[PDB]
Ligand SMILES: Nc1nc2c(ncn2[C@@H]2O[C@H](COP(=O)(O)OP(=O)(O)O)[C@@H](O)[C@H]2O)c(=O)[nH]1
């Protein structure tokens with residue numbers, strides 16, 4: 001009954017009904033996880049209806065944004081997000097930490113990767129057409145993000161394989177020259193890589209330089225990915241990986257709790273460590289024990 | 293099949309690698325770690341056979357040492373620029389000069405010691421960290437140092453693979469991984485950073501005094517060190533040797549190792565349980581249809597899992 005209201009309020013566009021929905025989905029308590037799953041399944045059915053009633057075309061554009069600390073991410077999101085909402089867009093910003101004036105904006109929602117897909121789906125369900133996933137670095141959590149988005153963007157300061165677009169930040173005042181230099185270096189680096197051709201642009205949230213041109217290259221990437229069929233192929237691939245991880249997690253809870261498996265596990269771990277048994281043979285044994 | 297076995301040329305290879313490891317040859321240990329790190333199916337089959345031979349020898353070694361452990365495993369972490377590299381170099385020369393055979397294994401999601409015949413330093417590339425620790429102990433190393441970077445996730449996995457977790461925190465707001473630290477070293481306590489380091493130290497001593505104790509015998513210490521002046525480095529090693537002694541005497545080291553071993557063995561078993569399951573033909577068939585039903589919102593992952601488990605059984 002509670003799920004049905006939080007569902008209705010989220011799909012009607014009420015910000016609080018989506019802010020509580022994400023908190024629910026993020027919970028570790030068993031009863032709260034059961035409520036989150038029911039809610040997510042209602043959203044999944046509706047999400048499928050909305051795309052079918054949009055002639056198979058997706059309803060949002062998922063953007064992954066990353067860079068080092070101090071790159072100018074927060075300042076960029078604030079400028080870029082205001083530019084989006086003013087043009088008619090409803091924008092979500094979801095930060096994922098491996099470690100403003102936009103918060104006052106009625107058309108924007110500002111909130112590891114364990115529930116990120118669930119949050120993306122809740123936002124698309126709520127009616128947002130631009131989902132921005134913000135992260136830090138050039139490593140592990142950054143790779144998980146690239147696999148949850150349509151387009152991956154890198155913000156690199158003035159003072160790369162997976163990136164669809166690279167933006168050289170703070171290209172203002174006495175940092176224009178170093179920014180033009182770093183840009184030249186990245187354009188040079190890409191020209192050597194074997195594969196849309198990733199672009200290197202210079203921006204400034206302080207001056208506004210290159211921000212509109214960035215959004216236009218983003219819309220071009222989007223257009224190409226839809227026309228070529230690569231966007232749906234990528235989403236399909238991403239969906240398979242996500243669905244399988246949800247199913248394998250359920251396969252293992254059911255398996256590790258089964259009384260025969262529980263009862264044999266301690267003895268089996270001892271045998272493996274003492275070098276009396278291999279993990280593969282210990283696993284074969286357990287699988288047979290579960291079956292019989 | 294039996295299960296199948298190993299080609300005689302592969303069996304000669306593992307035996308040569310095994311003998312050169314246990315005899316202490318640095319290249320054989322280096323090749324063995326590379327072998328364990330491989331993602332290719334035949335290489336993983338060879339790595340498992342080798343690791344099983346080292347597991348049996350490791351047990352022989354511990355029995356011929358009256359059940360007492362043969363290496364002290366230390367975990368070292370901190371932010372970039374804390375002074376980890378500089379510290380390892382100073383501390384490693386200090387230990388090897390005192391008769392120890394030291395391994396340094398760096399692990400990353402984020403020198404004069406390299407010339408040392410008594411040190412083994414392996415570059416950055418936690419899935420195989422336990423296997424690498426065991427290969428080093430098999431090779432005869434008595435001090436295993438696991439270096440990581442950060443105050444997060446990969447740092448928590450390290451704390452669960454070592455006997456003692458040490459944090460290197462610079463003098464110039466954690467809440468945090470300070471909970472898992474056995475010892476905290478406030479680095480660069482030299483020159484005009486002595487005063488900030490004394491202040492930062494007081495803050496961490498204050499923070500710990502609030503946390504509930506992970507041990508009945510050890511109280512985490514906050515010391516100030518400087519690899520530049522040598523300050524606190526000898527005193528650090530002495531508190532490390534004390535932690536070790538208290539942990540052995542109290543039985544907490546073996547309890548901790550036991551707990552850690554259960555987590556490791558379960559992960560290995562679980563991984564083989566999922567390869568065997570996901571490759572099962574009745575399972576493989578069904579997976580595509582099932583993932584569609586979950587995504588369309590027609591089915592829950594738990595119900596999809598139940599239909600998959602039934603399919604495997606029948
Ligand atoms: N000169 C200049 N500085 C900027 C610009 N954008 C951000 N900064 C500054 O760079 C620093 C980092 O900004 P922030 O957005 O918070 O970086 P973040 O850590 O990546 O989120 C701050 O002191 C900003 O004021 C820019 O376009 N021009």
Ligand SMILES: Nc1nc2c(ncn2[C@@H]2O[C@H](COP(=O)(O)OP(=O)(O)O)[C@@H](O)[C@H]2O)c(=O)[nH]1
Pocket residue numbers: 370371372373374375376377378379479480481482483517518519520521
């Ligand atoms: N003043 C002072 N500087 C140090 C000390 N140890 C390291 N440094 C400096 O701090 C910086 C970080 O050192 P490094 O060992 O490479 O840090 P890491 O990234 O944690 O491995 C370097 O510029 C070092 O020279 C110290 O004991 N005293």
